[PDB]
Amino acid sequence: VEWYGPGRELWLGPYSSGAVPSYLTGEFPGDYGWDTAGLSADPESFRRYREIELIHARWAMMGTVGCLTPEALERYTGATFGESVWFKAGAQIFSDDGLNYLGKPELIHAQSILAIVWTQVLIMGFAEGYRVNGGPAGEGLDRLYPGEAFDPLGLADDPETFAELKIKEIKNGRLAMFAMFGFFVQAIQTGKGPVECWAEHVADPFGSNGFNVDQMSKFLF
Amino acid sequence: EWYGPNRAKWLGPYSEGAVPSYLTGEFAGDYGWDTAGLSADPQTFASFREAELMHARWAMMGVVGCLTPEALSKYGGVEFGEAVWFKAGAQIFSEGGLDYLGNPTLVHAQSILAIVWIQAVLMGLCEGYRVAGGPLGEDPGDAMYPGGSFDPMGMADDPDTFAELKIKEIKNGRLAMFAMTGFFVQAIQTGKGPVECWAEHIANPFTNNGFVYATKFF
Amino acid sequence: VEFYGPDRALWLGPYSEGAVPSYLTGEFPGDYGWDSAGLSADPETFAANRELELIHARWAMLGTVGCLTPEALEKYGGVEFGEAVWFKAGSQIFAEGGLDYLGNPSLVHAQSILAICWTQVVLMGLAEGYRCSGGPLGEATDPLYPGEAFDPMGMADDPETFAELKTKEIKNGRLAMFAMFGFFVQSLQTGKGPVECWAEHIADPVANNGFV
Numbered sequence: 001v002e003w004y005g006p007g008r009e010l011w012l013g014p015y016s017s018g019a020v021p022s023y024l025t026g027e028f029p030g031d032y033g034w035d036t037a038g039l040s041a042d043p044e045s046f047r048r049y050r051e052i053e054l055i056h057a058r059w060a061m062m063g064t065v066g067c068l069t070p071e072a073l074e075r076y077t078g079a080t081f082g083e084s085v086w087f088k089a090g091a092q093i094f095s096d097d098g099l100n101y102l103g104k105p106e107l108i109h110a111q112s113i114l115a116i117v118w119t120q121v122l123i124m125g126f127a128e129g130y131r132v133n134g135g136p137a138g139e140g141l142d143r144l145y146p147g148e149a150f151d152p153l154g155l156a157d158d159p160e161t162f163a164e165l166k167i168k169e170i171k172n173g174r175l176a177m178f179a180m181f182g183f184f185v186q187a188i189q190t191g192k193g194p195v196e197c198w199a200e201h202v203a204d205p206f207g208s209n210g211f212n213v214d215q216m217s218k219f220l221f
Numbered sequence: 222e223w224y225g226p227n228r229a230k231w232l233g234p235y236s237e238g239a240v241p242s243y244l245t246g247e248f249a250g251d252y253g254w255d256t257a258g259l260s261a262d263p264q265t266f267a268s269f270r271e272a273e274l275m276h277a278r279w280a281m282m283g284v285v286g287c288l289t290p291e292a293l294s295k296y297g298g299v300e301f302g303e304a305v306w307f308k309a310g311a312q313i314f315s316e317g318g319l320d321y322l323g324n325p326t327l328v329h330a331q332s333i334l335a336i337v338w339i340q341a342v343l344m345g346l347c348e349g350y351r352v353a354g355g356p357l358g359e360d361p362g363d364a365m366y367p368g369g370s371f372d373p374m375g376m377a378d379d380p381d382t383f384a385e386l387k388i389k390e391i392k393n394g395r396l397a398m399f400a401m402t403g404f405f406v407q408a409i410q411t412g413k414g415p416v417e418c419w420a421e422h423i424a425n426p427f428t429n430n431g432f433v434y435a436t437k438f439f
Numbered sequence: 440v441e442f443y444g445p446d447r448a449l450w451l452g453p454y455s456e457g458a459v460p461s462y463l464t465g466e467f468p469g470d471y472g473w474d475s476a477g478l479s480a481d482p483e484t485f486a487a488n489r490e491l492e493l494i495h496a497r498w499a500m501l502g503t504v505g506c507l508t509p510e511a512l513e514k515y516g517g518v519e520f521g522e523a524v525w526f527k528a529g530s531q532i533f534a535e536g537g538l539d540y541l542g543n544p545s546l547v548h549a550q551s552i553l554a555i556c557w558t559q560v561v562l563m564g565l566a567e568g569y570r571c572s573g574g575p576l577g578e579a580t581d582p583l584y585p586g587e588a589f590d591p592m593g594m595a596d597d598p599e600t601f602a603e604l605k606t607k608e609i610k611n612g613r614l615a616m617f618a619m620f621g622f623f624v625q626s627l628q629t630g631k632g633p634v635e636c637w638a639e640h641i642a643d644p645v646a647n648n649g650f651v
């Protein structure tokens with residue numbers, strides 16, 4: 001096909017022949033043959049890295065959406081968040097009114113960071129224990145693609161469509177991981193939110209670009 | 222002396238027991254230094270060897286490229302806009318521009334965007350040729366030692382001299398990598414170019430050690 | 440039967456099965472089956488990682504004790520040091536009086552950082568070479584548990600007690616590594632010594648914390 005097997009699409013296009021590791025045979029989703037460092041030579045380490053990459057991809061997609069949503073709502077809509085910027089959103093818990101969802105005092109209206117931290121650690125501990133072990137939402141199933149309770153719409157029923165959807169998921173997750181790394185670097189250098197950066201760039205693409213005197217005078221703060 | 226069981230190991234006389242079993246002194250620069258076991262897997266070993274050699278060659282280029290402008294400006298007579306390596310790039314954001322060797326008739330770069338994109342295209346083509354062959358060859362070598370077109374003088378036509386030159390290359394590249402890390406750390410801590418730091422140290426060595434800016438880690 | 444074998448104490452408790460890699464069979468001390476990144480799948484890499492972890496653990500225990508002792512002695516004992524704070528303790532070599540041990544002017548009274556560094560490199564290079572290959576104090580029988588001259592009290596003469604003590608050592612060392620990471624992060628964030636942080640937290644805990 002196009003995403004699996006020897007005739008798939010590789011990570012260097014025409015110049016990939018000879019740079020493809022022998023253990024990357026196009027069996028798993030997102031197999032572009034990019035293992036120049038040889039970190040996934042061991043099959044056990046390979047599947048550990050696949051699990052880590054997929055979890056990172058899903059977390060990064062969720063984080064990209066949740067970082068773009070508030071700042072976009074503040075600038076391009078009448079929403080009035082206390083701190084719409086993603087890297088300054090955690091600081092509202094130290095403010096007078098705390099975290100207000102959508103800016104309304106009547107939603108959540110957090111005041112203590114202690115309850116937030118415990119509740120989160122307890123909930124995520126149970127969730128991750130269930131992910132690695134199984135629980136109320138499934139006992140067996142794959143560690144990366146459980147399905148059943150996590151595939152209610154039944155989109156992953158045809159094996160070919162399942163493989164294509166896995167390719168789409170891993171590619172979108174890698175794109176979101178790249179975007180989240182970009183968010184980190186822009187926050188460190190520019191100090192302003194991704195939506196603000198995008199608006200400034202589309203305003204003056206040649207002037208307000210990344211090659212700036214102050215934006216490049218320091219390496220990672 | 223550089224290959225085989227009786228070679229020169231990393232810990233010297235205290236090397237017995239510190240040499241991994243998979244480091245049998247077959248490849249260039251095998252001092253038996255692997256304490257983390259990162260190169261135990263032969264495929265990972267080969268990948269790490271390729272990465273090490275590419276880093277070594279890049280660092281040997283980089284040390285000369287970082288020392289030559291500063292040396293020419295300080296000890297010679299050339300008048301570069303920015304002599305130090307860690308502020309050379311900032312010269313692109315100057316009224317005069319990025320003039321080569323201070324001459325406004327040479328290079329006279331004015332646009333960082335064109336520079337970065339032509340560099341990206343050219344280096345993409347070069348690195349694609351490096352790992353998959355191209356106009357200069359079909360990559361006959363191990364992707365580290367092609368030869369044929371990258372060895373025009375024929376200095377590696379004798380296997381013994383080839384092995385000796387590989388040892389010399391890897392040792393020089395490791396030394397250059399060490400010096401390049403030194404350049405990075407000196408730039409971060411002291412904020413001065415390598416030539417300036419070296420000249421200062423030769424003046425009053427006992428007072429200008431690295432134990433002056435020991436505070437403020439990075 | 441609790442820290443070794445198949446039915447061990449694992450790093451996830453009841454949610455551990457299906458997350459413990461097959462190459463962690465509980466043969467070595469401190470085997471909670473925590474290898475989620477697959478960094479120790481290769482047995483030789485696993486042995487190298489075990490050696491690195493144990494050396495780090497011992498160094499971290501020593502460092503935790505040696506970072507807590509001066510500040511605790513200054514704050515509670517009364518001994519006046521030049522810089523009792525662990526991350527400020529290096530700088531006193533650059534002071535006028537110098538690095539005087541325990542504040543007393545007749546102890547050590549170091550005046551040269553260069554001499555200190557160039558003696559430490561030699562002494563520790565010799566010590567590390569003896570650790571890897573053996574020397575005056577042994578023949579490097581075991582890279583991690585040489586015994587003999589390094590076990591003068593003879594507390595490792597029983598295999599069961601030896602295994603129990605190895606488990607205790609590795610757990611204490613992991614705890615000390617965690618504490619040293621905490622020390623580093625507190626120094627970077629708060630800028631004050633661990634004893635000062637602990638005293639301030641015990642004074643008013645509900646306000647003096649990491650979220651300030």
Ligand code: CHL
Nearest residue numbers: 009010011012013014015032174219337340341345346349
């Ligand atoms: C034929 C040309 C072709 C080339 C040259 C590449 C090259 C690349 N592809 Mg690619 N592809 C190509 C065709 C294709 N690709 C793909 C599908 C993919 C995918 C899915 C992915 C890639 C990725 C990559 C990158 C992996 C290596 C890397 O990270 O470099 C970067 C390393 C460098 C050293 C670049 C340095 C040059 C740069 C100008 C530096 C910038 C200079 C700064 C100003 C200095 C920084 C300052 C200081 C502080 C450091 C690389 C850019 C991966 C990627 O995007 O990772 C990032 C990836 O996931 N490719 C397809 C579809 C089948 C192609 C079809 O023809």
Ligand code: CHL
Nearest residue numbers: 229230231232233234235252395438556559560564565568
């Ligand atoms: C018998 C004595 C002998 C000893 C003890 C060593 C020891 C060493 N050799 Mg060596 N060699 C020796 C004989 C020989 N060597 C070599 C050929 C080589 C080579 C080719 C290489 C070595 C390297 C090394 C180093 C590898 C381990 C390391 O990185 O430690 C360093 C780790 C430490 C923890 C020591 C640091 C001490 C320092 C005082 C710490 C203090 C830090 C700061 C002051 C403050 C801290 C900073 C804070 C703020 C974060 C190590 C210094 C390698 C190297 O140079 O890598 C760097 C390397 O490539 N050796 C030959 C020729 C065959 C020898 C012949 O007898």
Ligand SMILES: CC1=C[C@H](O)CC(C)(C)[C@H]1/C=C/C(C)=C/C=C/C(C)=C/C=C/C=C(C)/C=C/C=C(\CO)C(=O)CC1=C(C)C[C@@H](O)CC1(C)C
Nearest residue numbers: 034035036037038056059060063066067086089177180181
């Ligand atoms: C391939 C390969 C082969 C070679 O051989 C070796 C090799 C080169 C190494 C190797 C290549 C590997 C590569 C490239 C590695 C790159 C890894 C990267 C960049 C991973 C990025 C991860 C990004 C993540 C998870 C972001 C999560 C964000 C969240 C949390 O969900 C929030 O936003 C949460 C959030 C939200 C939503 C609102 C805010 O207000 C507050 C916060 C809490 C921040």
Ligand SMILES: CC1=C[C@H](O)CC(C)(C)[C@H]1/C=C/C(C)=C/C=C/C(C)=C/C=C/C=C(C)/C=C/C=C(\CO)C(=O)CC1=C(C)C[C@@H](O)CC1(C)C
Nearest residue numbers: 254255256257258276279280283286287306309398401402
């Ligand atoms: C052995 C071993 C076994 C154990 O078991 C585990 C272990 C200990 C981990 C392991 C040991 C491994 C070790 C020691 C790792 C060390 C790796 C290091 C330090 C690599 C260093 C790389 C250095 C490089 C490429 C520098 C290039 C510079 C350039 C680019 O060409 C320019 O200067 C370019 C340039 C020039 C020329 C002019 C300037 O104006 C502008 C710029 C762009 C900067």
Ligand SMILES: CC1=C[C@H](O)CC(C)(C)[C@H]1/C=C/C(C)=C/C=C/C(C)=C/C=C/C=C(C)/C=C/C=C(\CO)C(=O)CC1=C(C)C[C@@H](O)CC1(C)C
Nearest residue numbers: 233406410430431432433434435436437438439556560564
């Ligand atoms: C035996 C033998 C026999 C053969 O026959 C020939 C042979 C092979 C040649 C020969 C071999 C010899 C061998 C192997 C010996 C090994 C030598 C060693 C280990 C020397 C190490 C010296 C260590 C030094 C100076 C550390 C100083 C740190 C500074 C100062 O600058 C900081 O400020 C620290 C610092 C701070 C505080 C803030 C950070 O931000 C930045 C940094 C720099 C990290």
Ligand SMILES: CC1=C[C@H](O)CC(C)(C)[C@H]1/C=C/C(C)=C/C=C/C(C)=C/C=C/C=C(C)/C=C/C=C(\CO)C(=O)CC1=C(C)C[C@@H](O)CC1(C)C
Nearest residue numbers: 473474475476477495498499502505506525528616619620
């Ligand atoms: C398990 C696992 C499985 C997965 O699959 C992948 C995985 C998650 C990655 C993996 C997990 C691994 C993990 C968690 C890694 C964590 C590593 C850490 C935090 C190690 C910490 C080490 C800290 C040390 C040595 C401290 C030494 C201190 C000294 C020196 O002795 C002094 O204080 C010396 C000193 C003293 C005493 C007085 C002061 O004044 C001056 C100084 C010099 C500072």
